[PDB]
């Protein structure tokens, strides 16, 4: 899935818009009716750590 989301940049007052590819398995929508808005699979459990 070609995702697009907002993200805070190095400037604390500014942000940045990026895009990245994520698998469907690590993608969970907020609800099953809206569509096109999703979240990470592990967001309501804990915050992952990038290796």
């Amino acid at each position, epitope marked *: 899935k070609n995702c*697009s989301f*907002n993200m805070t*940049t190095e*400037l604390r*007052d*500014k*942000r*940045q*818009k*990026v*895009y990245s590819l994520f698998y469907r398995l690590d993608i969970v929508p907020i609800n099953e009716n809206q569509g096109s808005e999703y979240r990470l699979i592990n967001c309501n459990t804990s915050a992952c750590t990038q290796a």
Partner: antibody, heavy 132, light 106 residues
Framework: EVQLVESGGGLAKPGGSLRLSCAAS????????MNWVRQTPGKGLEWISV????????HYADSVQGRFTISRDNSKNTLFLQMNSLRPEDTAVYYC?????????????????????????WGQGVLVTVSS | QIVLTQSPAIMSASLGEEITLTCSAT?????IHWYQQKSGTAPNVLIY???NLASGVPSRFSGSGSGTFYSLTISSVETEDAADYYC?????????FGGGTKLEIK
């Protein structure tokens, strides 16, 4: 290639209302801004409004603030500009253009802010005016 | 607010004659984009970011500048070059264009 056409412009009533239109294809219209400029007969080019991606803001010019409004439909990839209380001095050859690159990058408030924008692709010259 | 101004307003050049177009502003900007338009057509872009030329445009067009002074240099002038040019700014509001410069074959 990038193919874009515009329609809806033409004769109208002085001080009444009219709604322009512009269609785009060949690219991700939801990730690119849209600008509306005007070229009066025999003079230079004039910019009047700009619409941001996702319908964030609608920064206008001082001569058209409160009179005209720009809206977009990313679902249908159609850009329509609403004209209200247009006067005969507002006659010009309006153009529908697209910015240089997409909004993906650093920004302050609206997603496409702080990015080198130059009109690279334009449409057909439509004439908008009012008469009897 | 920033206001742009071009000079000269009207110029006449012959075939193969060296000319120079300039654009100025009341405040410093990051870059100035040059354009050209013909009656009834769509304005095309030629030089962006003040140094990089557009794709497919002839190499006769050139330009440079910094601060509040910018210029457009046409090494060779042909019959098709007779048109109206402009300069556009993007740094601050209101994203206005230049004063416009008409070119005619001498």
């Amino acid at each position: 290639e990038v193919q874009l056409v515009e329609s809806g412009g033409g004769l109208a009533k002085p001080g009444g209302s009219l709604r322009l239109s512009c269609a785009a294809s060949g690219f991700t219209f939801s990730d690119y801004w849209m600008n509306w400029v005007r070229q009066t007969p025999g003079k230079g080019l004039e910019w009047i409004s700009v619409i941001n991606s996702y319908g964030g803001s609608t920064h206008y010019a001082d001569s058209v603030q409160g009179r005209f409004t720009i809206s977009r439909d990313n679902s249908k990839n159609t850009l329509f500009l609403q004209m209200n209380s247009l006067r005969p001095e507002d006659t010009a050859v309006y153009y529908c253009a697209k910015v240089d690159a997409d909004d993906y990058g650093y920004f302050s408030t609206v997603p496409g802010d702080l990015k080198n924008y130059y009109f690279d692709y334009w449409g057909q010259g439509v004439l908008v005016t009012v008469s009897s | 607010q920033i206001v742009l101004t071009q000079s000269p307003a009207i110029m006449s050049a012959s075939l193969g004659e060296e000319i120079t177009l300039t654009c100025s502003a009341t405040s410093s900007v990051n870059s100035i984009h040059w354009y050209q338009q013909k009656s009834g057509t769509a304005p095309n872009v030629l030089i962006y970011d003040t140094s990089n030329l557009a794709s497919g445009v002839p190499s006769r067009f050139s330009g440079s500048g910094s601060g509040t002074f910018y210029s457009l240099t046409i090494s060779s002038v042909e019959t098709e070059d007779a048109a109206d040019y402009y300069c556009h700014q993007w740094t601050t509001y209101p994203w206005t264009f230049g004063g416009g410069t008409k070119l005619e074959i001498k």
